[PDB]
Amino acid sequence: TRCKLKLLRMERIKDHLLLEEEFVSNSEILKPFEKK
Amino acid sequence: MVDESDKKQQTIDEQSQISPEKQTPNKKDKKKEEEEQLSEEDAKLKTDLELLVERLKEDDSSLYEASLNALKESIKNSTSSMTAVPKPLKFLRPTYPDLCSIYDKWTDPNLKSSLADVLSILAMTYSENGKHDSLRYRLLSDVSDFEGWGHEYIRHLALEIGEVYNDQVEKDAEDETSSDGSKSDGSAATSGFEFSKEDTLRLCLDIVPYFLKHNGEEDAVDLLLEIESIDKLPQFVDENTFQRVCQYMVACVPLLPPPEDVAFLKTAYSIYLSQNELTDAIALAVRLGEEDMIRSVFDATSDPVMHKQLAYILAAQKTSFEYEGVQDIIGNGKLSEHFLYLAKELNLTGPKVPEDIYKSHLDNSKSVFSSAGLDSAQQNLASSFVNGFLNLGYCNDKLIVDNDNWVYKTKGDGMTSAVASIGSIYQWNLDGLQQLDKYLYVDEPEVKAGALLGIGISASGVHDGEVEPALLLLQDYVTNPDTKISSAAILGLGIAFAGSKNDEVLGLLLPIAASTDLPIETAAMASLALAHVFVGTCNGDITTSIMDNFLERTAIELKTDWVRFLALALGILYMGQGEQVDDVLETISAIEHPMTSAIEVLVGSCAYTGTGDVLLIQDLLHRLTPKNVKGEEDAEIKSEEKKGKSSDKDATTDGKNDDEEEEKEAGIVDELAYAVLGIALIALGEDIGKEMSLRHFGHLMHYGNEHIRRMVPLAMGIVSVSDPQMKVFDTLTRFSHDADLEVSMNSIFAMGLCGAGTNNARLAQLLRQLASYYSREQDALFITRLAQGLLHLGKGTMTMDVFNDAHVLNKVTLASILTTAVGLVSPSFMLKHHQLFYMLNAGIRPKFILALNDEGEPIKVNVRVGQAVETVGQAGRPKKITGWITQSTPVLLNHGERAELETDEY
Amino acid sequence: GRNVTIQLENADTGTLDTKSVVGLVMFSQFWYWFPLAHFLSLSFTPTTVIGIRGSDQAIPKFQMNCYAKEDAFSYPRMYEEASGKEVEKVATAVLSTTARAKARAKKTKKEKG
């Protein structure tokens, strides 16, 4: 019950954080196109 | 129906099949039509109240839908009634449950939002008279037992949760937040919370922490405090309520900001002290680190029984386990004043008894002279060192050591690391001093430095026995001005007395060698030596170290490595609280350099600890910025750039760890889950992030003390055979080490065979072989875990050698330091009062991976073992007391605690 | 250089400017032979009031009052063109990604703590 609630709070800030990070990280401007 | 002839009490009966609807025109039309009829409605008020009880006897949606048709509209100011100020006020009481019914029990979303406001006023206004208290009370206490009350009482309190949440959501708070539109604190609402809480500690286990956390304040736990202290024995037994407290506090506490995060712990500590069980309470005393608090609990344990019995033994052992040793010194003097025995108590508070129990254990695990390592080149150096690592803890390897051949056969700086590692054979024990002393007098400057470092490593088994002090040996070599000799020696002092505060330690270290006068890297070790002392207890955040960091950093910044040593040291010193680390964060930030900002991030990681709200987000805005600078370009000066980039990567993992240790166990799985996805993201993002991140990832796994120890470590290791960096093997393997011959059985075969095979540089070979051999422990010889004692997520004191040196480039000078790995793990023995070694029986559950244990309540299934056993990280940890055969009660009640057992055997 | 306008006819006498018309017919045809395109040149006529001081044939510097709205007859700008656009666009692309990768997390926790 309660044990389950404690976990919800963490799972919803992990997803959010990741999603935002991801834009940059994947690229969107990084655009490797160097010689290799 | 709504008719103005259904007002009568004649039609109670005829109606009541369908649903009572006598009430409907009785509080609607009569109120409007005449105000003589409000007084008439008062005489009818008694009938109307009993109808509510009848409609809660049979709980069905039909008889709530059907009853109300306009009881919902009419409340007080609907009908423009306010006449005789008393009458409509008493008429709030019947219409209040009415609304609650149509909000939820017949499911309807719109009514939840809209009437959330209406309802909260009605409760606030009438609770001031204290006659809403009385309406609530008759369903709370269930004198008449039915289904109705069980959902009605939930509603009343659902609304209160609404009222305190208004503080959290907006600064406007109070009335001005109209989700309720009723203040969080008044002279009518407060008297409602308390009354509800007393009754509902009995009826529910989970509505009470709901109110606590959404309030997001210590105002919620003050009202609870007084309530719990009333409810503690009479309503339900001391042990059962004690369970309720430990649940409640851990749910509310991770959320809250740093000044109040601590406040919830002071309230919990004080509850625990009051209740008979102080086993939990001693734990809380470690966390705050206030000297005052350890004195209070410790005395509370000793004062009830004026003879040694269970009482003095219990007090002593609880302090012992924390091998910070800060507690031990505090506890001795109370015990020594009584003088039942002076010596046995001092020994048992002190770490002397922890040395002795291990001696018994070794015999079983079997004393080995076993060595691993190969001849020739840079492996000739290795093999020597490796004998040390393999003979973890106290072990007989006396005869191998007795040969001077092997020692003098080492070359270079490797000679230094050889003598230090002989200390690691004799780790956690005085005995084996004699071999080291020999080196200290004879040949090379190199082996003199080595002798001193190793004497450090060995003497760790004391800090409050005060039997062969570290200070006796170690003073003299500070005085010898040769930089190498002095450095080994003043670091040594730091390790041996560890966390313990003693006059001797302060006065040795009062002179520091950290200055611009020796540019030498090895002078930095004074401030690092200080860091041991402070940790494990509330920091002074000593200003001496700040002054010398700055001086040396500005003056020489050509050597990045010098100044990195200084920076991480201040960082380590800071562990244990964040509050005063905020204050000095300003001091450093005043002066600014590209160099300063390496410091900003590191000390910040300690500082902002006390919430994940700020901490987690912040160290990810920082991770983002490097990617952005590079992506733009796509579409002395060198020393500055390098430091910035490397520290940022390091600080990112470190912050995650600080968060997980302090906060609940749900956060460990969760951070780890961010972490793994995160690798792909940083590999994509940059070449430089790819290399560096590996090195810290094995340190994330270990410092975080991850639940899961199966699929993830093995994934990472396989992947980095190919990838650059072999320092990732070192960091990772110390996680793999904590459950011996399990994760590491794999490690040895895979890495140790392939490393030898594909060899194309001996330096790499050295790194791979050293990790792979270390990770294994011959037939489960002593393990080194992060756990300090009762803390298993405890702030490390002698295991932060990994934090220091994973960060900086690998070196031959590093190999010496890395022999330190002190923090051994006690067996679990049932003891009473005669200290009879080994356990009778205890439960361990070795199947743990669950992220839904967060209370701290053991998985009580176990599988029963009769052999004494070391406590295995997250694979052995849950601990139940089993000794019911001779009929016993826990005096020390386990919570998965590392602690040895104590029982009262009848 | 934003100084010419194409005249259809002479507006003062209400009669065809001959040179311009012949320009335009020849301009239209260019599918067949692209350098027919150049005849558009002849239709350009410049537009300016030019005072001549006496019969000396020198231009006086003097000024005239003009009752008009300034904004209307502001001298047309230097354009951004494609070159200027790339620089400015790529600058915006950088910022835009970075923004949202930090803003979303920051705003939620800004207030609550």
Swiss-Prot record, chain A:
Transmembrane segments: none
Described purpose of this protein according to its UniProt entry: The 26S proteasome is involved in the ATP-dependent degradation of ubiquitinated proteins. The regulatory (or ATPase) complex confers ATP dependency and substrate specificity to the 26S complex. Has ATPase activity.
Name of the protein in question: 26S proteasome regulatory subunit 4 homolog
Family in the record: Belongs to the AAA ATPase family.
Localization annotation: Cytoplasm; Nucleus
Signal peptide boundaries: none
Curated annotation (Swiss-Prot), chain B:
Organism: Saccharomyces cerevisiae (strain ATCC 204508 / S288c)
Family stated for the protein in its record: Belongs to the proteasome subunit S2 family.
A GO molecular-function descriptor: enzyme regulator activity
Intervals holding PC repeats: 417-449, 450-487, 488-522, 523-563, 566-598, 714-745, 746-780
Residues in coiled coil: none
Cellular component GO terms held in the UniProt record: cytoplasm; endoplasmic reticulum; nucleus; proteasome complex; proteasome regulatory particle, base subcomplex; proteasome storage granule
Regions of compositional bias (Basic and acidic residues) in chain numbering: 1-11, 24-34
Superkingdom of source: Eukaryota
PTM sites of type Phosphothreonine: T24
Entry protein name: 26S proteasome regulatory subunit RPN1
Physiological role: Acts as a regulatory subunit of the 26S proteasome which is involved in the ATP-dependent degradation of ubiquitinated proteins.
Gene: RPN1
From Swiss-Prot, chain C:
Assembly description: Interacts with UBR1.
The PC repeat ranges on this chain: 1-25
More info: Present with 4750 molecules/cell in log phase SD medium.
Family that this chain belongs to: Belongs to the proteasome subunit S1 family.
Residues bearing the modification Phosphothreonine: T92
Organism: Saccharomyces cerevisiae (strain ATCC 204508 / S288c)
Record-given protein name: 26S proteasome regulatory subunit RPN2
Modifications after synthesis and translation: N-acetylated by NAT1.
Compositional bias segments (type: Basic residues): 101-110
Function text: Acts as a regulatory subunit of the 26S proteasome which is involved in the ATP-dependent degradation of ubiquitinated proteins.
